[PDB]
Design a protein around this ligand. Structure first.
Ligand SMILES: CCCCCCCCCCCCO[C@@H]1O[C@H](CO)[C@@H](O[C@H]2O[C@H](CO)[C@@H](O)[C@H](O)[C@H]2O)[C@H](O)[C@H]1O
Ligand SMILES: CCCCCCCCCCCCO[C@@H]1O[C@H](CO)[C@@H](O[C@H]2O[C@H](CO)[C@@H](O)[C@H](O)[C@H]2O)[C@H](O)[C@H]1O
Ligand SMILES: CCCCCCCCCCCCO[C@@H]1O[C@H](CO)[C@@H](O[C@H]2O[C@H](CO)[C@@H](O)[C@H](O)[C@H]2O)[C@H](O)[C@H]1O
Ligand SMILES: CCCCCCCCCC(=O)OC[C@H](CO)OC(=O)CCCCCCCCC
Ligand SMILES: NCc1cccc(-c2ccc3nc(N4CCNCC4)c(Cl)cc3c2)c1
Ligand SMILES: CCCCCCCCCCCCCC
Ligand SMILES: CCCCCCCCCCCC
Ligand SMILES: CCCCCCCCCCCC
Ligand SMILES: CCCCCCCCCCCC
Ligand SMILES: CCCCCCCCCC
Ligand SMILES: CCCCCCCC
Ligand SMILES: CCCCCCCC
Ligand SMILES: CCCCCCCC
Ligand SMILES: CCCCCCCC
Ligand SMILES: CCCCCC
Ligand SMILES: CCCCCC
Lengths: 1031, 240, 96
């Protein structure tokens, strides 16, 4: 290939251009994401039982559905909440790699078996099956800047004109309305109802009869009579459309002929289907859409599609209506990736400059500068071939690959410029023989370095895709580099290389002397090798200590420009009190974080655990990273200060928290525990078992911290007993009693009506003032068979009791989720082991399990050490083949600790952990260290084999020759990864982490290698030899 | 596929305007389109026009005074005049439907309405005339929706010598002058033509670029490729 | 049976349309409701979409909207089919 393209430089350019075009087309079409997909699919079933308490939900809906959830492939676990808002959510979590489309199909096939067993009221609310992430992709906020629309008006406008099209958009897995669509609200008055001897049953019956849509056939319809000339649709009753029409529904006519209209017994208005969710944007009335990403969908593509759909609605908005953007996770993805692109460019420029410093010729420097862009662009095309995405790890692969392939062309350009100095061959003639000397070693050394990374591509688990895409990127770039160095570089060496002071004179001479003291120092070390042997072992023990000393995590938290605040009041607390707490939260961000917070979108009545009067959330968006200098203005410090400030709020749990890189893996030290009722003990006994476990955990601050329940405490409830005998004696129907009670105090979805062209719901319910007080119960009358009106007090009794507002189940059994973490210094494994010990001492019938992040922990254990062992073994073997020797490879292997120590030094002093980014930098360090060692050994051995020089002369001749080119390429990359170390802005946490380990490892791998590699080579060959060298 | 010639336009009710206002906006657009025979041809609705329908109002007060239930009234009307699927029977081993409906001669004309009686609670038979009134009105025999909103589909084609792209441009200009709340969209072939057209320039470029690069490698020259690429018109002229 | 276009639209078509959410790869949706008592809703998907997956996703969202439809329509049933105008042949059957 080399000789072929040396004669055909345009052919060479054509191949480079095609490579770059393919890479460019890949960049325009490849998915962009923060990380590869590692989150397991989750399918959620949601249902609603209006006016139902938690136990009614559980025992008529949740258990029925759960018992039908069987024969579902790839199911890891199932969990459910049943709450006293009438809501149930059942979440089925599947193995990574499961097709979410099939998981949804399988779940629904089983759900449809349960559907007919569910109460009609639940079926008619609509059961839903969704496949989405648990967290919000974004919140789309909607306000009215002219203040001409109330919160309720805006919410209805969003529900009726915006939500459905967003919900149909591909990649939108779930949409939450922060507010409610309008319904026709019939607010019943029990005094007027009783006055006219009517009940909610009569109201419901009359609405169904007089808000009807009647199929009435046709005049002249088929089959017709002969001679028919008229064909026309018959139109009878149609859905009512206005409060006025509902008001004149005729309930009855009295004896004297007077009419009782629905408006005589009820107030009639448009109002929300529910009144539980009320949002504000920077203190102003608002609504919005909380959007969740469909399983496996691309976040950036989905956000783009959402914006395009919203753009189609904006021109038709009523006056004043405006979309705001209070919470969006996707800009961070886009901006963090662009910042790695910027550092990638900056790394290339910084390499071009450090080479012009050493080469001091634009021509000689340009050839390498052209090879790297060609290789990197081509590596994007390989990502497309492998189906990978442009993400943090493939982008870090682009940057770090430079250090392992930049020497490819340099070795070629330099081995030519030397042939033109030794001999007088022209640039074309010199390139041919030059390529004949290095071509084979170039291919073979690239294979040895690839061995460093190939094993890591077989990493298992959900974590595996992270290491796989990084490794493939590195290896692909090195492979393409060899190809470019055998095609383009020889052509450019044979067409551009010029045939063969000042600041540079100063530089050159300085280096000349430094090279002299270097070679002198080397020769002196060769005579004192014994001393430096001992120095090497303590480098290896130090490396060992720092390795075990260094803590380990998964992925650093990033400042993503957004965060959330949780507001949790005790159950039984009112909407009004939750708003008071939300006002305090909003006030704090708008007054005490003026410099950092851009907007607050606060929702009363919505939490992630579930709805309720006693829960809320605040979505916070920050100003740009550039406007928030210093770590005190980053999300971590902001949320810490906020939580500290909110700790002084009474009767409420309020805390601000950062988004975790991967919610699935969750906390670095946290655990997720499930207490299980294994023997039909019941809720009260399970609570006591929970409390026993929580008390014992408090007795170990040594190992456990913040061990708490995730759910809600029991609260008073109003128990009413209907007396069957008294109702039978009075002739009061049990159905009339239950409908009157449920319709008045819980509400009833009667049927649909048409509001401005859109089908919407009709609800009957007591007006608020008649369902606030226990004494109000007796103001409701039911009509008996004999026509007498009977108050509830005549056939019922009541008492206060305690009960649960949120019942939890895990894998089909009653459960209570317990969160917690390991104490400082302690490991999560230690904390979990203790929890298991404590759990074993709990009452009979009480079991446990681990879920969520703790399911992943115990599932995928530590597998990195074995793969590092395999990598080293394979690298040694590839070196044995390259040098046809079992012993010479050790002269290269022994340099690995010299680099690993620096990466551990840098990570320790700078305070980093053994996370994903330290490991990908640690593998890079191993390869970079071996690379630098081969830049010495390959030449030292080349003289003993080709120039016949002795062991000590060849070694010292090589180091003096190679000290300049080695320090060139090494310092260029050290500087090249500078933008990763000094990085600020989006994604700087990952950038800083990966840069620190690599740069720290390069420094030690370069300063120590130029002194130790000569020692490794001379000592190894002396030991493993017979009658060869030393002369 | 359909004819895949012309364009396929959707007029959309974006603000709850209702069927009558949408029709008016449609007619406005059709009339304007008719003023550009040089650009647009045969711009027409794909659907149906409103027709006379027989509106019958049941008087609730009169029904309640006579003791006639509304369910008996509406079942009697619907089952007789519209027909009713009751349940299934088995005909020679195959399950089939049972339908009740009026014999044809009793459901043809408005005067037939009064021949249908409903039994009140007290046993008396009450004719439909006693508790109903009727009037002629207009309504739609075919209501259309597009992406969940009321819509009216409009078909048409570019005039001779004009491109469909140009005809679409004008349609969009005319649509921009319609009443508040009326939007539009392209569907079907027109959705298809816009997306295929947006790709063509880049596909031509890639073809031309790659052809040049292959020839340059073949001849080891950046210029000699042109001597081959100049042949393109020679065949095309005779085909045209 | 016996329904006018507006009755069909406002008790059937709008309800089904309002439930066509969370389906993948949808390009657009269109419907007609007519005075023969019939509704047809057509969902058109991106080229390359698996037609079986598109149909089961539509069918499953429909299944969960059936409780919201009139009893007469639940009784008749609601069919979900892949759309295609290509017939191999039409066999006529006549009586002479
Ligand atoms: C030698 C100069 C460096 C090479 C030039 C850049 C090459 C192209 C880089 C990728 C595209 C541009 O992306 C580069 O990074 C981000 C992109 O959001 C911008 O960064 C800027 O805006 C972002 C938000 O948008 C802020 O958070 C950030 O603090 C600010 O610096 C840079 O101004 C831009 O130059
Ligand atoms: C070796 C040095 C050079 C290395 C350069 C690496 C840069 C990689 C950064 C790309 C990240 C952003 O990736 C971004 O993805 C979107 C969505 O597909 C592309 O979006 C594109 O869409 C279409 C085609 O898909 C194009 O016609 C359009 O012009 C463009 O908007 C952006 O053009 C691309 O920039
Ligand atoms: C899955 C199983 C397969 C995996 C096997 C792993 C193979 C790893 C090989 C490591 C690299 C070998 O590297 C190879 O070493 C030999 C040692 O003689 C070098 O040296 C050789 O060069 C060429 C090869 O044609 C010969 O003309 C020359 O006489 C010989 O010395 C090669 O130039 C280099 O390419
Ligand atoms: C005068 C120009 C003639 C263009 C004729 C194109 C007709 C086919 C159109 C079509 O289907 O497009 C497909 C495809 C798009 O990339 O067409 C093309 O790529 C057309 C260009 C190919 C010819 C350039 C190479 C020079 C010859 C050595
Ligand atoms: N054996 C004769 C001989 C004499 C003199 C020199 C070289 C030579 C050639 C190619 C080389 N290629 C190397 N890398 C850089 C990292 N990318 C993979 C390839 C390295 Cl490290 C050393 C290299 C030595 C070979
Ligand atoms: C992307 C296009 C590359 C074309 C490069 C042209 C060859 C290099 C310039 C001429 C070299 C001869 C001067 C000594
Ligand atoms: C299970 C992961 C497969 C690993 C693929 C092999 C790694 C080397 C590929 C290099 C591509 C040029
Ligand atoms: C003529 C040789 C070109 C191929 C270069 C191969 C470089 C090593 C790839 C490593 C694969 C595991
Ligand atoms: C299709 C794009 C080709 C552009 C390259 C033009 C070649 C330059 C002609 C003169 C070279 C001596
Ligand atoms: C260097 C280019 C490698 C091959 C690119 C092929 C593109 C694959 C798209 C799926
Ligand atoms: C999942 C398919 C991977 C395709 C690998 C292509 C190798 C260049
Ligand atoms: C899970 C074991 C993977 C080992 C990879 C070995 C590559 C040579
Ligand atoms: C891993 C195998 C090494 C064997 C070395 C044998 C030396 C003669
Ligand atoms: C994309 C084609 C580039 C060729 C230009 C070469 C002119 C010397
Ligand atoms: C003989 C060398 C040809 C290689 C082309 C890729
Ligand atoms: C001459 C061998 C060609 C190899 C291309 C990958």
């Amino acid at each position: 290939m080399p000789n072929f393209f040396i004669d055909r430089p345009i052919f060479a350019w054509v191949i480079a251009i095609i490579i770059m075009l393919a890479g460019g087309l890949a960049i325009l079409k490849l998915p962009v994401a923060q990380y590869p997909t590692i989150a397991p699919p989750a399918v959620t079933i949601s249902a609603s039982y209006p006016g139902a308490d938690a136990k009614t939900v559980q025992d008529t809906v949740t258990q029925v559905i759960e018992q039908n959830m069987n024969g579902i492939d790839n199911l890891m676990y199932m969990s459910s909440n049943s709450d006293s808002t009438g809501t149930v959510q059942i979440t089925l979590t599947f193995e990574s790699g499961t097709d979410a489309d099939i998981a949804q199909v399988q779940v629904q096939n089983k759900l449809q078996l349960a559907m007919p067993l569910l109460p009609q009221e639940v079926q008619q609310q609509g059961v839903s099956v969704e496949k989405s992430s648990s967290s919000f992709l974004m919140v789309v906020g909607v306000i009215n800047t002219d203040g001409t629309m109330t919160q309720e008006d805006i919410s209805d406008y969003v529900a009726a004109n915006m939500k459905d099209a967003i919900s149909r958009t591909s990649g939108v897995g779930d949409v939450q309305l922060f507010g409610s669509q309008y319904a026709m609200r019939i607010w019943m008055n029990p005094n007027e109802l009783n006055k006219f001897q009517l009940t909610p049953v009569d109201v419901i019956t009359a609405i169904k009869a007089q808000n009807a849509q009647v199929a009435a056939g046709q005049l002249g319809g088929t089959p017709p009579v002969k001679g028919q000339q008229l064909n026309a649709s018959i139109i009878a009753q149609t859905r009512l459309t206005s409060t006025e029409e509902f008001g004149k529904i005729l309930l009855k006519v009295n004896q004297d002929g007077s009419r009782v209209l629905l408006r005589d017994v009820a107030k009639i208005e448009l109002g929300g289907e529910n009144y539980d969710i009320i949002a504000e944007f920077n203190g102003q009335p608002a609504s919005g859409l909380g959007i969740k990403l469909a399983t496996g969908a691309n976040a950036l593509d989905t956000a783009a599609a959402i914006r395009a759909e919203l753009a189609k609605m904006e021109p038709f908005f009523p006056s004043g209506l405006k979309i705001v953007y209070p919470y969006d996770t996707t800009p961070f993805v886009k901006i963090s990736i662009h910042e790695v692109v910027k550092t990638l460019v900056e790394a290339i420029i910084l390499v071009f400059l450090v080479m012009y410093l050493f080469l001091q010729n634009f021509r000689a420097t340009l050839i390498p500068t052209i090879a790297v862009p060609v290789v990197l662009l081509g590596t994007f095309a390989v990502l497309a071939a492998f189906g990978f995405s442009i993400n943090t790890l493939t982008m870090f692969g682009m940057v770090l690959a430079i250090g392992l392939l930049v020497d490819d062309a340099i070795v070629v350009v330099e081995n030519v410029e030397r042939v033109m100095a030794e001999e007088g061959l022209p640039p074309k003639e010199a390139t041919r023989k030059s390529m004949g000397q290095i071509q084979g070693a170039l291919v073979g050394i690239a294979m040895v370095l690839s061995a460093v990374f190939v094993p890591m591509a077989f990493f298992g688990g959900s974590t595996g895709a992270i290491y796989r895409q990084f490794s493939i990127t590195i290896v692909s770039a090195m492979a393409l580099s060899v190809l470019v160095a055998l095609i383009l570089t020889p052509a450019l060496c044979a067409t551009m290389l010029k045939p063969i002071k000042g600041f540079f004179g100063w530089f050159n001479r300085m280096f000349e002397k430094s090279t002299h003291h270097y070679t002198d120092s080397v020769g002196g070390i060769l005579r004192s090798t014994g001393r430096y042997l001992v120095l090497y072992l303590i480098i290896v023990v130090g490396m060992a200590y720092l390795f075990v000393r260094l803590p380990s995590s998964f992925l650093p938290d990033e400042d993503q420009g957004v965060f959330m605040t949780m507001v949790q009041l005790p159950a039984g607390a009112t909407q009004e009190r939750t708003q008071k707490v939300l006002n305090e939260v909003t006030h704090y961000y708008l007054t005490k974080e003026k410099n950092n917070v851009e907007s607050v979108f606060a929702v009363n009545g919505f939490g992630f655990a579930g709805r309720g009067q006693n829960t809320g959330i605040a979505f916070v968006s920050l100003k740009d990273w550039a406007d928030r200098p210093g770590e005190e203005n980053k999300v971590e410090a902001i949320t810490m200060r906020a939580t500290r400030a909110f700790s002084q709020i009474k009767d409420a749990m309020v805390f601000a928290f950062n988004l975790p890189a991967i919610v699935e893996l969750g906390t670095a030290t946290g655990f997720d525990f499930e207490l299980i009722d294994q023997a039909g003990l019941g809720h009260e006994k399970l609570t006591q078992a929970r409390n026993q476990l929580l008390a014992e955990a408090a007795k170990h601050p040594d190992m456990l911290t913040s061990v708490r329940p995730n759910g809600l405490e029991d609260t008073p409830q109003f128990k009413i007993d209907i007396d069957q005998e008294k109702a039978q004696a009075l002739g009061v129907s049990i159905n009339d009693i239950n409908t009157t009670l449920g319709a008045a105090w819980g509400g009833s979805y009667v049927n649909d009506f048409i509001d401005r062209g859109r089908v919407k719901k009709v609800y009957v319910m007591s007006e608020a003032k008649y369902r606030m007080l226990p004494d109000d119960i007796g103001d409701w009358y039911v009509r008996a068979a004999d026509g007498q009106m009977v108050p509830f007090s005549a056939f019922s009794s009541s008492r206060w009791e305690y009960g649960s507002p949120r019942l939890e189940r895990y894998n089909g059994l009653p459960s209570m989720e317990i969160l917690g973490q390991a104490a400082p210094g302690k490991s999560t494994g230690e904390a979990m082991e203790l929890m298991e010990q404590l759990a074993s001492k709990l009452p009979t019938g009480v079991g446990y399990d681990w879920t969520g992040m703790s399911y992943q922990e115990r599932l995928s254990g530590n597998q990195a050490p074995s793969l590092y062992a395999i990598s080293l073994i394979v690298v040694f073997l590839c070196l044995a083949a390259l040098y046809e020797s079992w012993s010479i490879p050790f002269s290269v292997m022994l340099v690995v600790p010299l680099g690993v120590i620096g990466a551990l030094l840098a990570a320790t002093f700078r305070g980093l952990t053994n996370d994903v980014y330290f490991q990908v930098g640690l593998l890079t360090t191993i390869g970079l260290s071996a690379k630098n060692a081969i830049l010495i050994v390959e030449f030292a051995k080349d003289l003993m084999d080709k120039e016949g020089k002795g062991l000590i002369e060849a070694t010292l001749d090589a180091v003096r020759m190679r000290l300049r080119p080695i320090l060139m390429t090494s310092l260029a990359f050290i500087l090249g990864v500078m933008p990763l170390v000094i990085s600020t802005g989006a994604g700087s946490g990952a950038q800083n982490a990966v840069g620190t380990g690599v740069m720290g490892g390069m420094v030690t791998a370069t300063v120590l290698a130029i002194f130790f590699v000569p020692v490794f080579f001379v000592v190894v060959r002396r030991r493993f030899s017979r009658k060869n060298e030393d002369i």
